[PDB]
A paper describes a structure:
There were four copies of AbiEi in the asymmetric unit, forming minor crystal contacts that are not predicted to be biologically relevant, and each copy contains minor variations in domain orientation, indicating some flexibility. Together with previous size exclusion chromatography data, we concluded that AbiEi is a 23 kDa monomer in solution. The N-terminal domain contains three α-helices, followed by three beta-strands forming an antiparallel sheet. The C-terminal domain begins with a single α-helix that is separated from a six-helix bundle by a row of four β-strands, which themselves pair into parallel and antiparallel β-sheets. One face of AbiEi is positively charged, and the reverse face is negatively charged. When AbiEi and Rv2827c are aligned via the N-terminal winged helix-turn-helix domain, the respective C-terminal domains differ in position relative to the N-terminal domains by ∼65°. In the AbiEi monomer, 16 identified residues were clustered at the C-terminus, forming a putative site for interaction. Overall, despite differing captured poses and discrepancy in size, AbiEi and Rv2827c are markedly similar in domain structure, fold and surface charge and are therefore structural homologs.
A recently characterized Abi system, AbiE from Streptococcus agalactiae V/R 2603, has been shown to act as a type IV TA system. AbiE encodes a DUF1814-family toxin (AbiEii), and a COG5340-family antitoxin (AbiEi).
Residue numbers in the entry: 1 to 195
């Protein structure tokens, strides 16, 4: 039955379950209310439930509420362990014209044209093990090169050096992105000093 499916999913999903997980499995969301009444899970945010062994995940909770926001810049660096800093704010990228409904205050929004909104998007686990959508390193570098003047100079230098030391560069992807984003020659000039 759908209840047995639901309970299997919770056990294998490390103690977090959402309304969207239910809709995806074809299970009425009121089943979560029933499990909450029984004490198996409890509600922490709108549509998000934890077991007694599930944990708060600020990145996953945020992207759950705002699924068009892709973690970018320092959030994308942090989530992929490309920096040692622990940011106290989110950097996200959304399509131009997107407005957040009741965002948190520790948020930097970056807008890009729809054609670029998912270029270099990839999925990685957060520090709490939940999958979120981020920009891969090559797309982060493109962003940094395009937007250098608007970026803290110490962060810019550190990030370029981190890519220089990154042993899993995908230069074909780097060049693909830079061509589409009209920044190939500045990216080639940047790469020259990092390899």
């Amino acid at each position: 039955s759908k209840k047995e499916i639901l309970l299997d999913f919770i056990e294998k999903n490390n103690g977090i379950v959402t309304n969207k997980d239910c809709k995806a499995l074809g299970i009425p969301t009121i089943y979560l209310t029933r499990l909450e009444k029984e004490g198996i899970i409890f509600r922490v945010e709108k549509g998000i439930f934890l077991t007694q062994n599930g944990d708060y995940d600020e990145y996953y909770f945020f992207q759950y509420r705002f699924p068009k926001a892709i973690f970018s810049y320092i959030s994308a660096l942090y989530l992929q362990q490309f920096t040692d800093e622990i940011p106290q704010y989110f950097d996200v990228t959304v399509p131009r014209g997107y407005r957040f409904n009741t965002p948190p205050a520790n948020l930097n929004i970056h807008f890009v044209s729809k054609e670029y909104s998912e270029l270099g998007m990839t999925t990685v686990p957060t520090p709490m093990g939940n999958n979120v959508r981020v920009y891969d390193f090559e797309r982060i570098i493109c962003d940094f090169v395009i937007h250098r003047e608007k970026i803290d100079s110490e962060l810019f230098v550190k990030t370029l050096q981190s890519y220089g030391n990154y042993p899993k560069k995908n230069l074909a992807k780097l060049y693909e992105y830079a061509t589409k984003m009209n920044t190939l020659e500045k990216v080639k000039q940047t790469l020259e000093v990092l390899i």
